[PDB]
Amino acid sequence: HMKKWGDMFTWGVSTSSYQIEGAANQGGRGPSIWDTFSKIPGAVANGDNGDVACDHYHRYNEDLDLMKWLGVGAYRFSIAWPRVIPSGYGALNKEGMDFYDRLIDGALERGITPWPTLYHWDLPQSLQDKGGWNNRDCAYWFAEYSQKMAEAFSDRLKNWITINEPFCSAWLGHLYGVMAPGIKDLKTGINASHHLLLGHGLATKAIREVSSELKVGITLNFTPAITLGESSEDKLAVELADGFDNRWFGDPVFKAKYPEDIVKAFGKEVPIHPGDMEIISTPLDYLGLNYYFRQTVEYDATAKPLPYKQVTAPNVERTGMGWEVHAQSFTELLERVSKEYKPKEIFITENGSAWDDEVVDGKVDDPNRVSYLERHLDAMFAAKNKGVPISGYFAWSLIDNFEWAYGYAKRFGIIYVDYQTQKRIPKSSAYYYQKRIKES
Amino acid sequence: HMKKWGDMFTWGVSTSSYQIEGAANQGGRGPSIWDTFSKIPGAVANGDNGDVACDHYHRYNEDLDLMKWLGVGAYRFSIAWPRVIPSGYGALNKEGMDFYDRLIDGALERGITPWPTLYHWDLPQSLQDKGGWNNRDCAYWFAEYSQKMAEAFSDRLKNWITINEPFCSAWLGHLYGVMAPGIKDLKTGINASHHLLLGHGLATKAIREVSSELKVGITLNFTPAITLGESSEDKLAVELADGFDNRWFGDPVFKAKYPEDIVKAFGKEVPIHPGDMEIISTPLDYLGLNYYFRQTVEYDATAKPLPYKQVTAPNVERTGMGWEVHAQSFTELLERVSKEYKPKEIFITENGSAWDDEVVDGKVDDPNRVSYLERHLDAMFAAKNKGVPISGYFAWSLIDNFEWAYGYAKRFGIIYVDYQTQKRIPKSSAYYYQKRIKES
Amino acid sequence: HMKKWGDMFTWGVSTSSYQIEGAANQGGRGPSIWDTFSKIPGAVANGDNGDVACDHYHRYNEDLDLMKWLGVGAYRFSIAWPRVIPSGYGALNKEGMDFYDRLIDGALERGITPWPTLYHWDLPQSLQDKGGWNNRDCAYWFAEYSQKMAEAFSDRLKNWITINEPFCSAWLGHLYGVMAPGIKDLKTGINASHHLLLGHGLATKAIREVSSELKVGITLNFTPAITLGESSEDKLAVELADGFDNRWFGDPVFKAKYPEDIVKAFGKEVPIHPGDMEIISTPLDYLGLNYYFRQTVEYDATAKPLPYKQVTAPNVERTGMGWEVHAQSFTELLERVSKEYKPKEIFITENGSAWDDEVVDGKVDDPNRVSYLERHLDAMFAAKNKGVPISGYFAWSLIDNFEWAYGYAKRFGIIYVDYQTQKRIPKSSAYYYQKRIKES
Ligand SMILES: OC[C@H]1NC[C@H](O)[C@@H](O)[C@@H]1O
Ligand SMILES: OC[C@H]1NC[C@H](O)[C@@H](O)[C@@H]1O
Ligand SMILES: OC[C@H]1NC[C@H](O)[C@@H](O)[C@@H]1O
């Protein structure tokens, strides 16, 4: 499983539209559910929103220059659906499409392959007003949007990702209400999860109809579950958390079914129509895998919707998010996914870490982020050397940005953003990543 | 046979002088046999000629910049003998030599290693008027020209190629008359083949006399032969086609003899003088291998000079040239050459494909050329992983150019040339090649 | 030993402060022992000195541009102790610190990792006036200087080297008197060797106290010894020369003891205080290995301090220094060092060769330097493929420079320096090294 001649590996960085673009009410853009959600008192730390963010809508040439300087071969970005179709379905916003044309063409001029993500959580509010992902029609609206983007951009862009982290859009957005649109209802979360996955499948078929050379995948985040206890009920807690976070989304895509143990525990029906599971399980060219941390759980008969709770394990390394740092879990997750779901290949579409950064003498020295990055790259390559088909790695993120309900206080960039001036300052982790790209 | 530490691989692009330079009657250049041949009604499609071509004589800085942008480490180009010695033998044209000085120095400033080919078919007409390659003296004229080029440029240029594709210069130029100088006579083709190969050997010795650190090879195109029939006579047809196309030129270089079955079938004498076969078979640092397609043949008792004919096999993928696409033959050819001729190392000095390209919105999306390139690189690395010493790959061609008797209608570039404006437009295949160079 | 996914390799070039900087009495710099030594007639060939050298203090941006052009990932340089602390201990010289800040920041802007060496022989004369390395306090002065440099620069610089080639500073500087400070006394050489090594250990501990992520090593030159004789006394000569050159410095660092056979043969006491050997042998992240040549010796009962003499072996290839070229010794040395001393990893911090160069038509063609470089890189990778953990290679040197007692007459650069104009001219070896960096 050692390197052989001709083998390739792609190095990238990742962002998303609402987190960096700004220009939220400029260039014809319509509001997203995160514009609305960010206006709710208490929804986002410090009352932050994405109105300006990193002003990447105006500063994209600088950010593209930083990518070329890093030496990445690829740039994972998302298209803001409400920027290009403000009404969700209907007329294209030519000014919005022109922005992505300039972004794409600028990347290609610099030798960077853009990897578009079609849905990274910024659903048009116009479609939320019709029920959003609770409405089955939203899967079809998404597929039509996806087709239009492929028709516009696939002459240049050959590697597509449909949706990003349906776990967050479905469960965090519709069951726990801590992400847009902020709904708290199990049935709604179930419906949303099915329509996100159906949208993925319909969009995949729509993209392939544009051209047979195009590649398509989905990005799923996986959160491996462990328990500190030995009781059978604590082992059940691990099984339930794994089903809720991981198998609920992986099983439809790769096995054409929902995990029966979770379906039974929910006691609700997934709104599956004829043809849905064939569409959701349509073959993919790759899995986009997001990994950051493992969760520690224990049984809790009182917890809902499933009888387990999170545990904060003692004496473990944690990031500024409070997330456990455990790179060995990354290796084991990659091996598990390859055996369980057998994706043709895997791209790490996100991995990274957030820490308290300080600017000293105009510079940012972030050794904790360097250490996380080094150890997780090592863990990834450990899996690749065992035969897991990992074809590339995208660092989350190129720049500090709007970290959803945490706002701007949580910095994931390898490049620092001073939001007072929009100055970009490469951190120590940027120089480390630059070296790794060149010298591997 | 996997990668080991220290192993190297060279990525390049290839062109030739008459096909790109233009400035055919500028800078003191004298006419070549292709200037003459292109003036004959019916000799070249659409009446095309190389008077202007890609105007690389003036635009070489842009083309070198495109090479740096692609990331190639090497540039295979040819020196126009009639630009540097218009009378074929005698005085150097200082203006022509200064052009190659500027080209070479510009490549080196950009980190690109130029690989000069001394003869890529543009014999000075002054020498054709004395018999060209039919005249034994032409081997010596070529060797003197080669010595002068090494004396001028080998302070910088360490890797030389003498001649390119003697199959074309000898048989297509002097037996079939479809390439310059347009002669149609078997004995003349035999004489030309021997004097091309003798010129190669004399030039190799002359270059090594300039400096012992210099490396020298020859570029041969090989066209593997198959048959769809099972008869013994169709198997004989394969042997005859292989002998005519491949062994006629490979056997003198690597085995110091002409293939006896073809000599006997011709019924003519090769004009071999004392010392010739030792000179032709002088040890080489590498073979430059050109590969594009395999030929399908069958026996034909009426055919001349040998009793076989070409067959257009049914239901196979073909390029815009009508050439079969069969990358597995590339792997098998590389393995066979390594066993049969055992060159110290192999450089793919040409491989590529031509398709009808369309400019849409100022861009050129050429998925069929991308696919050919991907599959032939895969096939080449398959041979390298079996132990074949392939040390580099040069894509034919950087830019669309004058495709000999096909004229400009046949486009081999990974960069499109709009001949009305001389604009260069990178095709999808350019972005693919750029990625492969970086990420392998 | 199987190249695997994730393995890295660092390509660099090396210089040192006194050899390139110039500006010896500018920018607040205080004199070093080499400023003083170079003023003594007969100490340096042609009366050369480092007053101007390559004027890199003023031309560093040009030199950094040349490094970026070569494509190196790393730049090994030394900090001039008397430029940053002119009195050796005490006040920092802000102008000197600012120079290294600009150098470091310029390298990082270009994607180059600076590798600082803290002591490359330019001891402040103010400290020599107090006994220099003969004075135990010099080990502590060095450690305090090292701590201040890490405090200033380790926000950016993570890989440190303490001292370079104590063989030269101790034996050539204090026993043979052919390098600064020009002393000729065995006991002084022994004292100096101990305080250099103690300084290394104290500085390593001081650097690690600044930040636990910092890496530290030492650079040792090793000169493998052979004999042409078969007698038992000539085999003893090999053991003595190996002990004098190599084990005297390697054994303290990696085995916490001085080689007992050499201690006995000297018959002198090393000024070891309790605790010193634990300090000297403090664990290192890597060994910086310098290799240029092997020595041939024979027994000589009359020789001092040890009964052997150098032999000039007949009929071997030699550089312009008179040094034997024998790349196989490099492979065997790397294997031996890894087996006997087991450094966690090895960086080749210096290897290279000097030849008489000639400028012809504004260019420098140096095939003998190319050949040495090619063969020693091959020999290094042979050791890596046997499992030796060689993580990078730094060519000595980026530019021609002041070759100590040989002056400017001995040119080690892959880039030529015309000292009349300070023009930099890349040699053939620069283009070769550029290719190796890209294509390996
Ligand atoms: O939480 C960090 C990172 N993980 C997942 C999301 O895709 C991304 O937008 C977010 O910023
Ligand atoms: O036919 C394509 C290509 N192959 C052979 C020749 O070397 C080159 O000049 C030509 O353009
Ligand atoms: O002698 C060549 C080279 N060897 C070792 C020294 O570190 C360096 O300064 C010197 O120039």
Author numbering:
A (entry chain A), B (entry chain B), C (entry chain C): 0 to 439
Excerpt from the paper describing this PDB structure:
Here we report, in contrast, on a naturally occurring mutation of an otherwise invariant residue in the β-glucosidase BglM-G1 that balances a trade-off between structural stability and enzyme activity. β-glucosidases are enzymes hydrolyzing β-glycosidic bonds in substrates ranging from glycosides, to glucosylated flavonoids, glucosylceramides, and oligosaccharides, releasing nonreducing terminal glucosyl residues (see Ketudat et al. for a comprehensive review). They are also one of the key enzymes in the bioconversion of cellulosic material. The otherwise invariant arginine at position 75 changed to a histidine in this protein, while the other 36 amino acids deemed necessary for the function and structural integrity of members of this protein family remained unchanged. Our data indicate that the natural mutation to histidine at position 75 leads to the loss of an extensive electrostatic network, including a salt bridge in the active site region and implies that evolution of BglM-G1 traded a decrease in thermal stability for improved catalytic efficiency.
We, therefore, re-introduced arginine, replacing the histidine 75 in this enzyme, creating the BglM-G1 variant H75R. There was, however, a major difference in electrostatic interactions between the mutation site and the active site nucleophile. The naturally occurring histidine at position 75 in BglM-G1 formed only a single hydrogen bond with the backbone oxygen of threonine 116, while arginine at position 75 formed, in addition to hydrogen bond interactions with residues Gln163 and Thr116, a salt bridge with the catalytic nucleophile glutamate at position 349 Fig. 2 CD spectroscopic analysis and X-ray crystal structure of BglM-G1 and its H75R variant. Because the crystal structure showed that arginine at position 75 forms a strong electrostatic interaction with the active nucleophile glutamate 349, this should lead to a more rigid substrate binding site in the variant. Asparagine 163 and Glutamate 349 were the two residues that had electrostatic interactions with both the inhibitor and Arginine 75. We thus inspected the B-factor of the atoms in the side chain of these two amino acids. A higher B-factor indicates higher flexibility in the crystal. The lower B-factors of residues Asparagine 163 and Glutamate 349 in the substrate binding site of BglM-G1’s H75R variant indeed suggest that the higher Km could be the result of a lower conformational flexibility caused by the stabilizing effect of the electrostatic network formed by Arginine 75.
